[PDB]
Design a binder for this molecule. Sequence first.
Ligand SMILES: CC(=C/C/C=C(\C)CC(=O)O)/C=C1\CC[C@H](C)c2ccccc21
Ligand SMILES: CC(=C/C/C=C(\C)CC(=O)O)/C=C1\CC[C@H](C)c2ccccc21
Lengths: 11, 11, 214, 214
Amino acid sequence: KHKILHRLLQD
Amino acid sequence: KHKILHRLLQD
Amino acid sequence: EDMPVERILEAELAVEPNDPVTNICQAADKQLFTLVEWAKRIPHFSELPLDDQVILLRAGWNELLIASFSHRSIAVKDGILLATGLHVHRNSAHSAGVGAIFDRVLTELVSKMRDMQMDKTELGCLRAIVLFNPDSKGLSNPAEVEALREKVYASLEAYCKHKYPEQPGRFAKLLLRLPALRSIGLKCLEHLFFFKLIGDTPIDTFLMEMLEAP
Amino acid sequence: EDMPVERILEAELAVEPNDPVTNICQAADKQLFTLVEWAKRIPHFSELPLDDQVILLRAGWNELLIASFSHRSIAVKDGILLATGLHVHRNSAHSAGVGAIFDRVLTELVSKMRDMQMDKTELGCLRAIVLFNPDSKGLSNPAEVEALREKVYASLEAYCKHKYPEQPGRFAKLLLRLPALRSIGLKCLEHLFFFKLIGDTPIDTFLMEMLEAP
Ligand SMILES: CC(=C/C/C=C(\C)CC(=O)O)/C=C1\CC[C@H](C)c2ccccc21
Ligand SMILES: CC(=C/C/C=C(\C)CC(=O)O)/C=C1\CC[C@H](C)c2ccccc21
């Protein structure tokens, strides 16, 4: 879960 | 309203 | 001006020497009467118009009582000590359905108070800061209630730094517990309203009055 | 250590230059992306494990966004300025059913921020204090998050007293807004959950994700 949030933090 | 509270504060 | 921590401490020392939920509600009703006597011992409080006193107490009774049984439960293992002298263990609250909130009380409040060794004077001032809630709706003079709150944490900051010079962040650490207290105070109310709705769980008169409208 | 108010200020200056409810939800979704970029600019935040970053943001996004549009609405009459450039007037929120909470935002937050002229540096630190919430459940290392929070209000107290020497109670005044922010943050969530339940009112992906479980 939390697809978006994770992707944004990793970038 | 607030019977109890009022009586207690007044005493 | 005129908000000595000595008077605040005396207020605290003066008001305090099977279903776990039922025992909790019975204890909250008991303490509600004591809460009024405690407030009266708080400087200037009684000087406020009777109406504003009702507002301040009805708006903070839950957070004020929660802060009290918590600090009282510092020496307790995994539970809290009720004013009635009854101990409510963590497992007992869990087996009653109210484990989520009870755990929040132990972790965010009881445990933290214990980690920093919050003393009675510090506890008193915090509650006083809560009592003097300038955001309480209906207040005849919110500014005045605001001025009183400022005098409380002003005396509190003075107490700290002087009593705990080695801990410059103590003052902020204490104030930064109010948000948790606010969040927990609100959830506890939700539970009480549900308990009153379902019908089960006896609720005394004073507690019931606090659950009135607004 | 290493929590300069200059870095915090830059984070703030870097992230910001018909149904009122629909416009609010659309604005919250927009700011959610900006919130992540803002957090990254906060010292040490990015150094925390990815998981703890998700926890901290998911636990404070609502209070962090609420604090932002409020401070931004200081010069507004009776309303707030949304990130989308839209103004939501008090009457408009009232005619939409969300007048109770909108009024709490103006009175307890917007108005208060304006009365004390809370500056951007002060706003930044407060949000940072909220971001670094040591009470967030699931945290891999709550102690570390706690140490960071302490460094924030330590730098904040230093900023004040030095920037506003004539106002010894400013530091406490700022911290004593978090409880209101917590209370308002929680009520706003309730409304959002109801909006999602009823089905009406469009809700974008990022906002929707924040309304997920837990
Ligand atoms: C608002 C409130 C007050 C309790 C006050 C007490 C017991 C005071 C005291 O005995 O000193 C109600 C609580 C206080 C906290 C416990 C965990 C609780 C659990 C489930 C439902 C409600 C409550
Ligand atoms: C959690 C949340 C966030 C909004 C964030 C915004 C609009 C940010 C921004 O645009 O800068 C939701 C609110 C924020 C406050 C207003 C009054 C509101 C009213 C009714 C229902 C919900 C909400």
